Amino acid sequence: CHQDMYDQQKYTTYEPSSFFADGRSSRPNVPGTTPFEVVKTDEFLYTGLIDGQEVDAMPFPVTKDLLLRGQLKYNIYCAVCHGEAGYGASMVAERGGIVPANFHQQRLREAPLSHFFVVITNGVYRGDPENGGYQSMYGYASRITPEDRWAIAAYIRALQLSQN
């Protein structure tokens, strides 16, 4: 009955807006910008590519707190499909046709840490122009901070040591 300041004229976080073409007051990132005092000069910190090939390294030394953060972020974002132990057995692969990659196979055992960062950030092969194509791993750049992605890769190395 009151209805005074219940739905204000100011725009909230995910409030819809008729001013913009996509019907959303939340605006995307401007292409080619960075926040204040957030430097992007370390190319190895933000992508796994240095000279056009894999690196198998880390921008910072490993820490037990970093490994615990990587375990937490793995359990949040990565263990839904790949499993907690990393064997690729999960309810997502059971219900659908995901079948994710086992970290304890040879190809992922001798896989670089930079390759792990690339597959977290971007994913797998996209739609090829010949004979179709699709993406499965789908990339996790928007949801996970790159330091936490490196921590996830460190926990992947920890799980590979666990199952060997």
């Binding site: 807006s17 959303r24 990132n29 949801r143």
Partner: peptide, 13 residues
């Protein structure tokens, strides 16, 4: 409510 179609990279909502 109106979320994103693609989340921004360096942004926490």
């Amino acid at each position: 409510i109106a979320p994103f179609d693609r989340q921004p990279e360096g942004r926490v909502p």
